[model samples]
Target: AQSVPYGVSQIKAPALHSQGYTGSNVKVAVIDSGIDSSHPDLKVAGGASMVPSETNPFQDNNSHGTHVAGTVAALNNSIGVLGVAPSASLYAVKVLGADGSGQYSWIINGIEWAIANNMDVINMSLGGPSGSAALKAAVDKAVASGVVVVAAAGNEGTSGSSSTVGYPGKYPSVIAVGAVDSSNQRASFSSVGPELDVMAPGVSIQSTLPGNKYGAYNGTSMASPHVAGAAALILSKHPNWTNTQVRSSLENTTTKLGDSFYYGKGLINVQAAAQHHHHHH
Candidate 1:
């Protein structure tokens, strides 16, 4: 999936960038495939080799992480697709490898590592049905420690009555994000559930590629960074706000949607929500 031309604005005001929320000094931990740190579009601070001690941190085998990385903090070089938090720091955690699969243990270890390092925002743009006791424990502990965790609502569109949410996202602590179209309506591919916190532009979003090129991709994966970037923006100002406060401010201020499950409270308003946070508290 690709994004509409930068010709038009998809995000609502006050813009996330105008509220002095450039994600400065915030650390975003991206747990997914590796990132192209050397890419001119992606200016990553140093990242660890979570895939394995022998694996490279610059290789983005799945491209999912690369897209998510661009969304959170792709460089504002004026040469390619712009990022939400262009100045924010990035911590690449290779939870998924080239084949788009990895052990749940690696993901647990990655989250624990990010929290231990005091990373402010954790972005889990990948999700699956599999469950792990270790991951649940780590997620609980991280939020308790004041780290904001954002995740994808599974890509499976709702069929009928009841459905299951994605793991780690379904853990009840993390923010489960679904997807919306350019029209601000729920996309056909977005997952629906009570665990869902909000929806963002997940269809055809343009972001950094391995080289100098930009590509548009879709999925709940694309939706997750919109939250992660917003989290970084909020944390930049209200440094003392707890995880619950930050989460509540964003969710409660959202623009209500037509379908209860589709857009959750509403589409994310990074600038308005961040400003709302400052005045609300």
Candidate 2:
């Protein structure tokens, strides 16, 4: 995790960084397996784990959470991968089991914890194929409480001709993210659907790992954080903004790339989304 990742540059986060908008003081919860708190490139502000046996959010056995955390706020200390919001505080809300799957209860609990703890943004890099009424209720509650929620539009492309985005990403309340490569090509595995909110660089994304290491991973899992990080950037600029304002800003500011079914509003541009005057629905 020792480089300025292309996704960071692709979204034009550096320009925002120069303008003193590095997501300072914004709190983003990575509701995944867990995060490696000791990773030098990442600064885990503190978090809670909903896993029954895994009490510590810092112990990321699955490593997926650690990777996603880095993309959101990997410290910009001149080494390791720079994050979209380099100074944003990260919370490791471990909802997934070590095996990378979990019961919906775990996710509901994670969302509750995030809301109660006053987290500014919640990123669900995990999703299930089927919708859950309880899960949708929790996400809706969180968004209603002013917490910006984002999730991965599952890697269900090529599975069928119908919409593949999974819940709670498929839900109307959560921002669904699909994947694109550095060349701005849609990743073959990225799920396509009307619910997808935007595309981010997820293929071959270089980020941190557990055990103080760094690696490249591909998935809408990686894509979600870029939008989550974008949310953090916009929040860093407009702390008083509501969740709806942030959501609409992101949807309105993207660089259109292709069909809405595949690219949603297209690639996210943090600089544009972080603007104060252009905020709209």
Candidate 3:
């Protein structure tokens, strides 16, 4: 259908989709505000909220989580839109609060939950410039446990300048994603840094929103899930591949767009990664 979001097409996910990789059986924990569990276009298998005030993960007070979730695995319905990995199992690990800000403790615990739940992937779109020792340990542990962790390079842009990239994302263990437009031009808002891993469609990207709706939004947050979904697609096919293998495959199979500082290994190429995924096994 023409309804496939441009971002999905830009990353060439449909190639993998047509090949029968729907991210089935892979669990992705969207560690964000929350998800609108009732959204027809989204299938949230389960979730948890780390907010001290809210205990339900299905309620997305902030539309950020639902929008982010849609990119990871919205649905393969005839109507609305389709996600990169439409059938990937989604778990709402809500660590951010209603206002879309959260404490390190909440995020650390969310990572802990995903690792313990045996999640194959964890997408973290939220972060702060200031790093925390405990947070890094949690992320290190998640990766050590074989969970693929992806994060945003932060939307700090030049305003953040030297401090542009945020933490957890800045960590070596996480796949920190940068933002680019449909044309593959780097978005001005996408933070640039030595830690940037890969770039993805982030400008004016459309996906499911809360309140049974759909809309367009942009951020490195949006870019993060594209890689997450890609990871699921790869893992669903080659279930035995370690997290490092998946990460290496993605980093290696990418379009050489531009600066390594800005584009990392360049735009992620899932089709190539999956085909090349054959050799790794």
| Model 1 Cα lDDT, one tens digit per residue, 1-281 | 32323311454422656666678899899988888787787778766666774277667877778888888877656566667777889888787888877788888888888888888889998778877888899998999988999999888888685554688777788999888878887888788777777877888788877755678888888888878877887787677777898888778676667666656777776655666433211
Models 1 onward score TM values of: 0.92, 0.97, 0.96
Candidate 2 residue runs with Cα over 4 Å from true position? 277-281
Worst 10 contiguous positions by lDDT, candidate 3: 272-281
Deviation from truth (RMSD, Å), model 3: 2.2
Worst window of 10 by summed lDDT in candidate 1: 1-10
Model 1, residue 178: C-alpha shift (Å): 0.3
lDDT of 3 by residue, 1-281 (tens): 42888999888899989889989999999999999999999999998889999899999999999999999998997867899999999999999989999989999999999998999999998889899889999999999999999999998887544647899899999999999998888999898888998999999889999988899999999999999999999898788989999999888888878877777778888888877542211
lDDT of 2: 0.91
Query: Which number leads on lDDT?
Result: 2
User: lDDT at 255 for candidate 2?
Assistant: 90
Clashing pairs for model 3 are none
